[PDB]
């Protein structure tokens with residue numbers, strides 16, 4: 426019953442980190458180029474440099490986690506290309522050339538049609554469903570954690586620890602009791618959808634973060650986006666039910682949004698219905714022999 430995922434273990438001098446992209450709970454993400462030695466190719470990558478393990482046991486478990494990442498294989502979830510076994514271990518993935526979905530929707534709010542919005546809702550759901558099938562809880566699904574490979578193709582990234590705060594994305598039970606499950610991921614998925622449908626509005630803006638639990642327990646939720654019919658909005662609301670087992674399963678969300686993506690005009694009302702990150706690749710870097718990690722592998 427074998428697992429023949431290939432783990433590449435690479436020296437860091439085969440990479441040039443161009444710039445920092447961001448930081449999170451487990452360390453720092455760079456934009457870089459993989460230039461495998463004795464070749465004529467520069468491959469666009471992201472490199473996450475993990476902070477130092479605080480104990481021998483936790484250092485070991487970085488490798489268990491990398492074991493899990495290298496076996497993740499779905500078109501809508503990021504895929505480990507390799508690691509560098511420096512004292513602080515580096516994770517190498519393919520660069521998604523359009524950056525994160527949150528920035529993409531904000532910039533292009535006048536040029537995104539119902540078809541694209543609904544499709545992304547589908548693909549993200551396919552990615553979460555895959556992660557559920559693998560028993561992996563994401564814990565931080567939000568639009569900033571969805572990446573745009575092409576406008577027609579998005580991936581979930583930065584999923585949580587395999588073996589175990591964004592308050593305004595968290596299920597009620599996660600806020601109160603620190604319970605994270607696939608059904609709490611469904612809650613966050615609903616918020617991610619709301620972000621997309623508002624072209625990147627900040628959820629519960631103005632409401633302090635320390636009032637969120639109280640607001641939720643009292644029955645308040647994110648308001649209907651202007652472009653949403655009550656049909657799409659009801660799917661969101663169902664993800665935000667206090668009873669976790671009453672929420673849609675991701676596999677149901679794949680179906681619902683796929684149905685809607687047949688007649689997107691029925692479901693989203695956008696006028697004239699019928700990347701800053703990309704441009705930085707065009708400008709802020711040497712671009713001679715660049716080639717996708719698709720072509721090379």
Ligand SMILES: O=C(Nc1cccc(Oc2ccc(Nc3ncnc4ccn(CCOCCO)c34)cc2Cl)c1)NC1CCCCC1
Nearest residue numbers: 451471472473490516518520521524569570582583584586
């Ligand atoms: O660390 C993990 N898990 C984990 C799981 C998956 C990925 C992952 O690493 C990455 C995460 C995010 C990104 N980013 C991007 N990738 C690609 N193209 C772009 C373009 C803009 N970005 C930046 C915007 O990305 C949005 C997210 O910030 C990109 C890159 C990498 Cl390599 C770490 N588990 C630890 C648990 C505790 C013990 C140690 C392991």
